[PDB]
Amino acid sequence: LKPFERDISTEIYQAGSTPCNGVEGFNCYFPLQSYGFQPTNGVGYQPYR
């Protein structure tokens, strides 16, 4: 991403020959991961505004 660029795509990321972006399969990962904030986590693992 470039300065002041925002992403709105939900496509599945393509790894290797096997295509992705919704043709889910081997080497088809979703890049948008959840952070998973809990208070029981460490302080470096807590949300920062």
């Binding site: 790894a15 290797g16 020959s17 096997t18 081997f26």
Partner: protein
């Protein structure tokens, strides 16, 4: 090295690189590669990681 025929072979049931990217391995030069091979169960592949 020639990991490009093994990444795009698409005949493996496990294929992941840890600490390094699995999309570049024939561009990164190394010194000694040690290969250890063993056969286990299907309820023991997740333990090896």
């Amino acid at each position: 090295a020639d990991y490009s025929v093994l990444y795009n072979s698409a005949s493996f049931s496990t294929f992941k690189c840890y600490g390094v990217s699995p999309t570049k391995l024939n561009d990164l030069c190394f010194t000694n590669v040690y290969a250890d091979s063993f056969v286990i169960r299907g309820d023991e592949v997740r333990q090896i990681a």
